[PDB]
């Protein structure tokens, strides 16, 4: 689709699409940029992630509305058919993102910051697949999310300080995985509390701007702990 457009033009248009709140366009521009085959910078990785999180976030919100109506109706075929249509679309977007990570973003990512970022994405998009999966295939999808998050966690704990925002966001999302997907609320609570406490003890090392970045995500961990305890 985007093979004839320059990489730099795809990046520029992804930024314009974000300003215009055109997230499907944004995601298509960033897919085109990934498919140029070069590694992504920190800013470009963020554009890729923001684009797809907005696309799949709208699909997930729609799927939840439709799934609620469908469950109530089971307390014609149209509600199920339309929930299935939205579900298939959502699965297709998740498969597209997972395909970009597998061909070839992860394998070329050698610095800890890029590798953790992509493995967190891989965990997130398997988690969104798990949200709509039913049965034993749900089990293998759940394991794929778990494995991606665990590898990211292992690298992050070895290579990044406890206040690093990607390390923090990874721990936040892995704790949500434990609570919401893996039926492990105590593991969720433990991980959120340990992550929060270890970040708090490292705040003294940070500049004012880094302090703001880290404390914002720490508050999200606290917000989940408040809801869970």
């Amino acid at each position: 689709a985007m093979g004839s457009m320059e990489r730099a033009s795809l990046i520029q248009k992804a930024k314009l699409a974000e300003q215009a709140e055109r997230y499907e366009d944004m995601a298509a521009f960033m897919k085109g940029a990934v498919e140029k085959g070069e590694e992504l910078s920190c800013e470009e990785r963020n554009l890729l992630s923001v684009a797809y999180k907005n696309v799949v976030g709208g699909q997930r919100a729609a799927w939840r509305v439709l799934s609620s109506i469908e469950q109530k109706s089971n307390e014609g075929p149209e509600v199920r058919e339309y929930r299935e249509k939205v579900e298939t679309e959502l699965q297709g977007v998740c498969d597209t993102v997972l395909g970009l990570l597998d061909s070839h973003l992860i394998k070329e990512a050698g610095d800890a910051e890029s590798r953790v970022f992509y493995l967190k994405m891989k965990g997130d998009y398997y988690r969104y697949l798990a949200e709509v999966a039913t049965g034993d295939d749900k089990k293998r999808i759940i394991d794929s999310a778990r494995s991606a998050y665990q590898e990211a966690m292992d690298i992050s704990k070895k290579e990044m300080p406890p206040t690093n925002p990607i390390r923090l966001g990874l721990a936040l999302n892995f704790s949500v995985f434990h609570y919401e997907i893996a039926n492990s609320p105590e593991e969720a609570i433990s991980l959120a509390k340990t992550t929060f406490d270890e970040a708090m003890a490292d705040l003294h090392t940070l500049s004012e701007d880094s302090y703001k970045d880290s404390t914002l995500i720490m508050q999200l961990l606290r917000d989940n702990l408040t809801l869970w305890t």
Binding site: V50, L172, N173, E180, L220, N224, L227
Partner: peptide, 9 residues
Amino acid sequence: AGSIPGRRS
């Protein structure tokens, strides 16, 4: 339970 919103660059 909230994950990272992640929707604004």
